[PDB]
Amino acid sequence: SMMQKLVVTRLSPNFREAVTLSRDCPVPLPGDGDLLVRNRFVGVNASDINYSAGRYDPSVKPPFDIGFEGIGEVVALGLSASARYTVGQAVAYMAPGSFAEYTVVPASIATPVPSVKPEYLTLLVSGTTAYISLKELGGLSEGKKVLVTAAAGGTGQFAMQLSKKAKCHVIGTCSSDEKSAFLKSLGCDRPINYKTEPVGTVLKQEYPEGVDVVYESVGGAMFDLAVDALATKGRLIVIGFISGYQTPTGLSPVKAGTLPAKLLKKSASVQGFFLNHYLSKYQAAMSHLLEMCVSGDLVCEVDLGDLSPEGRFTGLESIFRAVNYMYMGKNTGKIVVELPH
Numbered sequence: 001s002m003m004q005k006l007v008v009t010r011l012s013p014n015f016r017e018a019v020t021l022s023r024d025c026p027v028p029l030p031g032d033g034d035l036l037v038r039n040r041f042v043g044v045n046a047s048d049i050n051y052s053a054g055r056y057d058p059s060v061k062p063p064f065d066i067g068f069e070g071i072g073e074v075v076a077l078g079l080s081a082s083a084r085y086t087v088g089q090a091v092a093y094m095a096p097g098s099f100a101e102y103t104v105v106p107a108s109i110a111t112p113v114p115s116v117k118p119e120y121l122t123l124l125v126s127g128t129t130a131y132i133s134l135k136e137l138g139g140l141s142e143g144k145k146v147l148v149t150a151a152a153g154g155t156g157q158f159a160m161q162l163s164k165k166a167k168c169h170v171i172g173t174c175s176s177d178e179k180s181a182f183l184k185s186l187g188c189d190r191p192i193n194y195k196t197e198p199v200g201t202v203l204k205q206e207y208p209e210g211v212d213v214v215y216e217s218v219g220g221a222m223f224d225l226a227v228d229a230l231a232t233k234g235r236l237i238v239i240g241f242i243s244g245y246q247t248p249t250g251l252s253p254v255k256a257g258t259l260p261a262k263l264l265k266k267s268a269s270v271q272g273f274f275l276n277h278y279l280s281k282y283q284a285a286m287s288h289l290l291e292m293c294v295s296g297d298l299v300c301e302v303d304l305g306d307l308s309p310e311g312r313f314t315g316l317e318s319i320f321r322a323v324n325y326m327y328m329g330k331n332t333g334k335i336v337v338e339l340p341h
């Protein structure tokens, strides 16, 4: 009858100062074409703080719901939705407002899943971003050199593995030796701990002809190193720039004043990617990722905070700590929060 959810009550990139936990919210009811899903796991995404800052659509004022992805059980549904779905069914979804005990989701956008496991949730946003961007914009083929930044993170783990499956030589940046050991276990050809080894020098010395593709999630100084490291006809994919999101504008400073000259001289490109412009590819990407995940052909690493200071991310209240965990760069794999029941 009543539930908890997170609500953006003031616009800010500081998630804690933007987002309030409301305790006595009515449970929303599904319409004819809708599922009501009881969330068991929810995904934490770097851009949750871009969302809370109001950067997705600056015309929209608080209050609004938050959280982009969920997995759980159908506990109620509209009559039309009941032709494809049934009460008790395990479903996952990408839609705003997953940070709630219950979320209304139109049946048309639900993804049926084998059971309610956090591994499947890693595929929804993190997996599909890596898959679709690389398939559509990567031009991957055997022997290409691929550099992945935030490689041990939520989407990075997939960009790594998909590039390896495309028979590419893959370099991955991360911030610790434990993350480097994880990258290695995924088949990474050259893991780099950027805190202990200078990435620019590694690339100049070991990849003098440059890299063919960059999956670039970090921005700032890493973006700059990436541009310099591009091969002739190289492609830098701008997936994100997380080093900037906490700032007031959300941007990360770059020394890009000579970027056009660099790109002309190399016949190289900088290509942006936004998931929501490629939704026509989503179902097929999800289907392929799910098959690999269920068959054990894809590592879907989940970080539920079990080794964080206050331990497992349980409950909506832990989302605040989970966002901090990401922004301290502590996670290995996809950060997920559990709503126990």
Ligand SMILES: NC(=O)c1ccc[n+]([C@@H]2O[C@H](COP(=O)([O-])OP(=O)(O)OC[C@H]3O[C@@H](n4cnc5c(N)ncnc54)[C@H](OP(=O)(O)O)[C@@H]3O)[C@@H](O)[C@H]2O)c1
Residues within 6 Å of the ligand: 044, 045, 046, 047, 125, 126, 129, 149, 150, 151, 152, 153, 154, 155, 156, 173, 174, 175, 176, 179, 217, 218, 238, 239, 240, 241, 242, 243, 244, 273, 274, 275, 276, 326, 327, 328, 329, 330, 331, 332, 333, 334, 335
């Ligand atoms: N374009 C799209 O449609 C789309 C969709 C989804 C996600 N993305 C992008 O994918 C990237 C990763 O998102 P995610 O949600 O999967 O997170 P994640 O990679 O699981 O976590 C972020 C990681 O980035 C590094 N990092 C954290 N804060 C940093 C900082 N202030 N400066 C530099 N590096 C920092 C850390 O790894 P290290 O150990 O490597 O430092 C941290 O583990 C983001 O840029 C996100 O916006 C884009």
Ligand SMILES: O=C(O)Cc1ccccc1Nc1c(Cl)cccc1Cl
Residues within 6 Å of the ligand: 056, 068, 094, 095, 096, 109, 276, 279
């Ligand atoms: O907006 C909707 O109706 C749900 C929906 C469906 C498919 C893809 C994206 C979205 N929503 C959405 C939006 Cl509008 C912004 C940021 C993140 C997400 Cl998941």
Ligand SMILES: O=C(O)Cc1ccccc1Nc1c(Cl)cccc1Cl
Residues within 6 Å of the ligand: 108, 109, 110, 111, 279, 280, 282, 283
């Ligand atoms: O199917 C399409 O035409 C693209 C599209 C546009 C808006 C919202 C969703 C979708 N596709 C879609 C579907 Cl059909 C199921 C699950 C997830 C997504 Cl993103």
Ligand SMILES: O=C(O)Cc1ccccc1Nc1c(Cl)cccc1Cl
Residues within 6 Å of the ligand: 131, 134, 135, 136, 138, 139, 140, 141, 161, 162, 163, 165, 166, 288
């Ligand atoms: O470019 C290609 O065709 C290879 C390619 C690139 C990016 C993403 C996926 C794929 N292929 C691919 C496919 Cl189609 C399914 C499962 C795993 C992989 Cl690596």
Ligand SMILES: O=C(O)Cc1ccccc1Nc1c(Cl)cccc1Cl
Residues within 6 Å of the ligand: 045, 046, 047, 048, 050, 051, 055, 056, 068, 094, 125, 239, 240, 241, 274, 275, 276
């Ligand atoms: O994630 C990013 O870096 C880009 C971005 C910016 C603002 C709002 C959403 C998104 N990405 C995004 C989208 Cl477009 C759909 C579902 C889930 C996510 Cl995390």
Ligand SMILES: [Cl-]
Residues within 6 Å of the ligand: 108, 109
């Ligand atoms: Cl649709």
Ligand SMILES: [Cl-]
Residues within 6 Å of the ligand: 194, 199, 221, 222
């Ligand atoms: Cl760096």
